[PDB]
Amino acid sequence: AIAPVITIDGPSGAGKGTLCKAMAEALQWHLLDSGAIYRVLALAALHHHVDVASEDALVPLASHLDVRFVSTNGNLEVILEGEDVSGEIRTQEVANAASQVAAFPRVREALLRRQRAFRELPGLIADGRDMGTVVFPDAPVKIFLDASSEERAHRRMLQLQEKGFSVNFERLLAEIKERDDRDRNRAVAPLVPAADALVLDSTTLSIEQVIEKALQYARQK
Ligand SMILES: Nc1ccn([C@@H]2O[C@H](COP(=O)(O)OP(=O)(O)O)[C@@H](O)[C@H]2O)c(=O)n1
C-alpha cells in the first residue's frame, strides 16, 4: 500500500509540538518534527564554522548531514554526528541561525528526500511550516494550527515565568511577530495554509479541545 499522512502546519508557538505528540501516540503512528531538522543543520553549521548567510557553503553540509532521530520512546532524541544534541537544538543561538538557513532554495531541496523518507507504515504525523504545501501536498489530512500573536506571547510568557526567567510582555510580542513576518513573507515556502486544510484557531480553545477536534477531523477522513 502507501502510508497515510496528517500534516500540521502553523506559526511559532501555536501548539504544534504538543498536538503532534498527542496524535502520534493516539494513532500509534510515526512523528516528524521538521523544525528539528533545520535546527540540527544550523547547529552543525555553527559547530563546523560554516557561514549561515551563504547558500554555497550550506549545500555540501545539508547534503551530507549525519543525523538520527531516535525512535520515539516517550521522549525524542536528536543525534548529530553521534552526539545527543536534543537540548542544544532548543537554544536561541540555534533557533536564530535556523531561520537564516531555512530561507535558501537549494538548502531546502537538499532536505526534501530526508523528510519524505519518514513516511512509513502505519502512517506519518508531520509537523512544520510547509508540510501540506510542499513536502506532503498529497497529504490526505491537512491541519493549519494558528492563534493570535498576543495569545501566543502570553503563553510563552507564562512558560518563562514557570522556569523563573524575567520577561515583559512587550518584548515577547515583538519577538513572535518578527518570527511571523519571516515565516510568512518568505519568498520560498512561506507559511500559508493549504487550500484543503482545516484551519484550527486555538486562541480560545484548551489543549484538550484542540486535540479532540484534531482527531475527529482526522478519523472522519
Ligand atoms: N517545515 C519547516 C519547519 C521549520 N522551518 C523553520 O525552522 C526554524 C525553526 O523551526 P521551529 O518551528 O522548530 O522553531 P521556531 O522558529 O517556531 O522558534 C523556523 O525558522 C522555521 O521557519 C521551516 O522553514 N520549515
Question: What is this entry, summarized?
Answer:
The protein is α/β, with parallel strands linked by helices and about 220 residues long.
Question: What can you tell me about this protein's structure?
Answer:
Its EC number is 2.7.4.25. One of its GO terms (molecular function) is ATP binding. It is found in: Cytoplasm. Belongs to the cytidylate kinase family. Type 1 subfamily. One of its GO terms (biological process) is nucleobase-containing small molecule interconversion. The PDB classes it as transferase. The strands form two sheets. This protein has a five-stranded parallel β-sheet. It has a three-stranded antiparallel β-sheet with strand order 3-4-5, covered by helices on one side. β3 and β4 form a beta hairpin. 48% of the residues lie in helices and 15% in strands. With 221 residues, the chain is of the alpha/beta class. The chain has nine helices and eight strands. The radius of gyration is 17 Å and the shape is globular. The chain has one domain: Rossmann fold. α2 packs across α4, α3 runs parallel beside α5 and α7 packs across α8. The structure holds cytidine-5'-diphosphate.
Alpha-beta content class? alpha/beta
Count of discrete alpha- or pi-helical segments spanning 4 or more residues: 9
Please estimate the helix content: 40-55%
The CATH superfamily bears the name P-loop containing nucleotide triphosphate hydrolases
- Bound ions, cofactors and other small molecules, one mention each: cytidine-5'-diphosphate
What is the rounded distance between the termini?
17 Å
Assembly status: monomer
State which percent range the strand residues make up.
15-25%
The CATH topology label is Rossmann fold
Order of helices and strands: EHEHHEEEHHEHEHHEH
- Main beta sheet, described? 5 strands, parallel
Q: What is the CATH architecture assignment?
A: 3-Layer(aba) Sandwich
DSSP strand count:
8
Radius of gyration: 17 Å
Q: Briefly, what CATH class?
A: Alpha Beta
**Total count of domains:** 1
Reading side by side through the largest sheet, how are the strands ordered? 2-6-1-7-8
User: Which word captures the global form?
Assistant: globular
